[PDB]
Amino acid sequence: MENIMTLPKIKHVRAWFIGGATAEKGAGGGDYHDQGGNHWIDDHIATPMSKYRDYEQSRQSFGINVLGTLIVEVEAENRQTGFAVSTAGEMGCFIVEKHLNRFIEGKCVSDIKLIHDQMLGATMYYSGSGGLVMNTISCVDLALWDLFGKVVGLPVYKLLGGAVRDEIQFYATGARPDLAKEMGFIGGKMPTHWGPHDGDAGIRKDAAMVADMREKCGPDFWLMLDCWMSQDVNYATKLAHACAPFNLKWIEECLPPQQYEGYRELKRNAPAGMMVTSGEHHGTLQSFRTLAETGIDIMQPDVGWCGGLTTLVEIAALAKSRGQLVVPHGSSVYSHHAVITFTNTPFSEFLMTSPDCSTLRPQFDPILLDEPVPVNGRIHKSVLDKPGFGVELNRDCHLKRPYSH
Amino acid sequence: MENIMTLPKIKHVRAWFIGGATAEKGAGGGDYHDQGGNHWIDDHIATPMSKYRDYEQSRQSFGINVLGTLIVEVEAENRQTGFAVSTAGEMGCFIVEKHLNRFIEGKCVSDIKLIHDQMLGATMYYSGSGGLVMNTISCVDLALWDLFGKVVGLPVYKLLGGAVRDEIQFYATGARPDLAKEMGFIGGKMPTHWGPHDGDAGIRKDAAMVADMREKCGPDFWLMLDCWMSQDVNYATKLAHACAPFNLKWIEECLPPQQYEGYRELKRNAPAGMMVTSGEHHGTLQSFRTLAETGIDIMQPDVGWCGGLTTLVEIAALAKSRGQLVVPHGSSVYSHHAVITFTNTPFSEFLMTSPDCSTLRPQFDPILLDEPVPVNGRIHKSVLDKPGFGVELNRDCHLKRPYSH
Numbered sequence: 001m002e003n004i005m006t007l008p009k010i011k012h013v014r015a016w017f018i019g020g021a022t023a024e025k026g027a028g029g030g031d032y033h034d035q036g037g038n039h040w041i042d043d044h045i046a047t048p049m050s051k052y053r054d055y056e057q058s059r060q061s062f063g064i065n066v067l068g069t070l071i072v073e074v075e076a077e078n079r080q081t082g083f084a085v086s087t088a089g090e091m092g093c094f095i096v097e098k099h100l101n102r103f104i105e106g107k108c109v110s111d112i113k114l115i116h117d118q119m120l121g122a123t124m125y126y127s128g129s130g131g132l133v134m135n136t137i138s139c140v141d142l143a144l145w146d147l148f149g150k151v152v153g154l155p156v157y158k159l160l161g162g163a164v165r166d167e168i169q170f171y172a173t174g175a176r177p178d179l180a181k182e183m184g185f186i187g188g189k190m191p192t193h194w195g196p197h198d199g200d201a202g203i204r205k206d207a208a209m210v211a212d213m214r215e216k217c218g219p220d221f222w223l224m225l226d227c228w229m230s231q232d233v234n235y236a237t238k239l240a241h242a243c244a245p246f247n248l249k250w251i252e253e254c255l256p257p258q259q260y261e262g263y264r265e266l267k268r269n270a271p272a273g274m275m276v277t278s279g280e281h282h283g284t285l286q287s288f289r290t291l292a293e294t295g296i297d298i299m300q301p302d303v304g305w306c307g308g309l310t311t312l313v314e315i316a317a318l319a320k321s322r323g324q325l326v327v328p329h330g331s332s333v334y335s336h337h338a339v340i341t342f343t344n345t346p347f348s349e350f351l352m353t354s355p356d357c358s359t360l361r362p363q364f365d366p367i368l369l370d371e372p373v374p375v376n377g378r379i380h381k382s383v384l385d386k387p388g389f390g391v392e393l394n395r396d397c398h399l400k401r402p403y404s405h
Numbered sequence: 406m407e408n409i410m411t412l413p414k415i416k417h418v419r420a421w422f423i424g425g426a427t428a429e430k431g432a433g434g435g436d437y438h439d440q441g442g443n444h445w446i447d448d449h450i451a452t453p454m455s456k457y458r459d460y461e462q463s464r465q466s467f468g469i470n471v472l473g474t475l476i477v478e479v480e481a482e483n484r485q486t487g488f489a490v491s492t493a494g495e496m497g498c499f500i501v502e503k504h505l506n507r508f509i510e511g512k513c514v515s516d517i518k519l520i521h522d523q524m525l526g527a528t529m530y531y532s533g534s535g536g537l538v539m540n541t542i543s544c545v546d547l548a549l550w551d552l553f554g555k556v557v558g559l560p561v562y563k564l565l566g567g568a569v570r571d572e573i574q575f576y577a578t579g580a581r582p583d584l585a586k587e588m589g590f591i592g593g594k595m596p597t598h599w600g601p602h603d604g605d606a607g608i609r610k611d612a613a614m615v616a617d618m619r620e621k622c623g624p625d626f627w628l629m630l631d632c633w634m635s636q637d638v639n640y641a642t643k644l645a646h647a648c649a650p651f652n653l654k655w656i657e658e659c660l661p662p663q664q665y666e667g668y669r670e671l672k673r674n675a676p677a678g679m680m681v682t683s684g685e686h687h688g689t690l691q692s693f694r695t696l697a698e699t700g701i702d703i704m705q706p707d708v709g710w711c712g713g714l715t716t717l718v719e720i721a722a723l724a725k726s727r728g729q730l731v732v733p734h735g736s737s738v739y740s741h742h743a744v745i746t747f748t749n750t751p752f753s754e755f756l757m758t759s760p761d762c763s764t765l766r767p768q769f770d771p772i773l774l775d776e777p778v779p780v781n782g783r784i785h786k787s788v789l790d791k792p793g794f795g796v797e798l799n800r801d802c803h804l805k806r807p808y809s810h
């Protein structure tokens with residue numbers, strides 16, 4: 001047998017940020033919510049805060065955009081680099097530059113699972129099993145998979161064991177599922193605009209929105225509702241049944257992430273055939289074990305928030321063992337390379353960054369160079385035939401380096 | 406009827422930090438683990454990372470001290486101030502100065518619960534239901550109660566409904582239960598030094614440690630083991646049974662926080678009469694509802710990490726409704742003013758900050774001025790008869806202000 005391919009050790013790990021409270025508002029990039037004005041993503045979307053007068057109209061108003069984008073780049077001894085982006089910004093930089101770097105630098109580019117376990121174990125006392133800290137860990141994990149793939153000379157999806165489908169089909173998230181159908185997507189997930197404090201009126205309004213789109217889009221085009229942790233079991237139940245006549249495919253994240261018991265009850269009260277989903281805000285494999293056992297149909301971890309690709313692959317296995325499906329939240333290429341290899345992820349999500357959901361603005365525009373976008377609502381595997389996650393970092397953005405070591 | 410007392414509005418909220426990766430290592434204060442060398446609290450304590458040779462001997466080596474102390478001060482328009490400290494440091498300052506301030510400033514000093522709900526709601530998307538972000542929220546909540554109490558001119562314990570006992574009795578956490586007994590404490594909790602990877606030898610060594618202290622302390626002085634999230638169900642079960650002959654009162658935090666199912670199984674497997682506890686790393690009332698339902702005997706939230714006093718009071722009610730006890734983790738005065746009013750908190754914890762557990766070094770030395778300490782292992786209620794939480798900020802410490810607004 002021939003000697004194996006030689007691998008360089010990791011020399012440096014650096015972190016930068018754009019957008020957020022300490023940079024330029026509306027920088028976009030990794031933080032899906034760091035947008036400008038008049039964006040659908042900030043137009044009266046129901047949240048745990050919309051019950052408050054001052055925070056009902058805009059999520060930006062309560063600070064859904066304060067973190068911004070975290071960018072993590074790992075440089076190997078041979079000068080090759082790998083990178084990834086997520087939501088964490090400046091604080092994420094502190095965590096990477098002042099803590100996690102000790103487990104990263106000096107390791108082989110292939111020591112990905114090891115670095116991952118050490119990051120999880122070393123931050124367990126302050127990570128809260130999700131959120132900001134987990135987004136940061138996820139970003140490092142992704143940058144490591146990117147570097148490894150680029151060093152080896154292969155797309156992440158091939159390293160994982162190959163594609164199980166020639167193309168990825170997408171459903172689009174935004175306020176215009178009708179426009180989305182035009183573009184070739186297989187469905188449209190709309191956000192709810194009213195919550196529990198609005199009562200029966202709120203239910204009629206969002207349900208009427210679903211009815212209208214069903215009329216506009218036809219019966220074969222999927223329709224879903226994203227509730228962004230804004231409801232309670234009773235309201236979610238009433239909304240689900242009110243939308244049942246229009247064949248709503250699923251009702252997503254009705255409750256805050258900790259309310260597992262509530263998800264179990266909501267799922268059992270759901271209209272026959274209608275799915276209940278959640279997961280984008282959960283983190284760590286164990287949390288998904290608890291979520292999976294509530295009986296919900298589909299878990300939706302965000303690859304950059306759940307713990308990274310390493311964790312995502314484990315969650316997929318968890319779901320498959322129960323004969324269920326896993327459909328990641330956004331994530332662009334970080335999801336593509338993963339889900340294209342999952343037999344239990346028959347479709348993916350494309351979150352409209354376009355202010356009016358009329359064009360195919362890239363998922364992480366503009367931080368990612370050469371970022372692929374659905375063509376006729378799909379991305380063929382050949383589009384991913386590039387090293388690592390196949391993209392480069394847009395240094396034209398005004399990246400900031402708040403910390404160093 | 407007389408006119409109610411005049412209450413000022415909150416004008417400014419400010420955040421500072423000491424210690425941590427960006428300041429002086431070993432600053433102490435809010436971060437119990439930000440200590441110097443030769444400290445019992447860093448002496449081969451078992452952790453989720455001690456299975457790694459490089460991180461077995463010292464928790465500081467894996468970064469248990471990177472955060473340091475967060476200090477939050479709220480100033481009212483009548484120039485009075487209220488403050489609190491916690492573990493979060495520089496990042497905590499970012500969250501307070503760049504996000505939470507919008508919900509704090511302009512409110513009445515009595516709008517504590519309102520500000521609390523808004524902080525939880527606006528950070529739900531990145532808080533992870535615990536850890537760093539929750540620690541920050543908790544610090545703000547405590548600063549608000551401190552200010553409200555100082556404005557009203559009453560100790561927090563009286564505002565809460567009065568003391569239900571004349572004195573708080575403490576058990577001491579550290580390597581010297583024997584010295585703790587001489588000091589007047591009612592019990593001594595020791596940290597385990599070995600983990601699952603150590604197998605039967607590990608169990609024998611820590612069980613021998615307990616046996617030794619049982620011989621030195623007598624049968625009525627309580628003995629407990631703290632496992633700091635370092636085990637799995639099987640190892641914890643074996644250790645518990647190995648210590649049963651010495652009447653170990655309880656075995657604490659054997660598992661990482663997300664492992665509720667494991668806690669349920671561990672409690673079921675525990676020796677008759679021996680208690681299983683956890684909770685210091687959990688956050689939000691909902692997580693405690695889930696934790697409570699696993700059947701563990703005592704939940705141990707840290708007032709500065711669980712969500713604050715506002716949240717601690719709710720957890721106490723939750724436990725009380727189940728006929729169970731709540732014994733907070735450390736917290737000094739922030740716990741004292743609350744627990745002295747809880748019928749179901751018969752005793753409290755004093756975590757040794759003295760390097761060798763031989764003296765009564767203040768719980769949060771040296772950030773808190775006039776910080777009370779147990780006398781004969783107790784703190785009489787009269788010691789708490791000062792406004793708010795009864796202490797002042799030690800400005801002699803080199804406080805840093807990384808952000809402003």
Ligand SMILES: [Mg+2]
Pocket residue numbers: 226227228252253280329
């Ligand atoms: Mg969603």
Ligand SMILES: [Mg+2]
Pocket residue numbers: 631632633657658685734
């Ligand atoms: Mg403990």
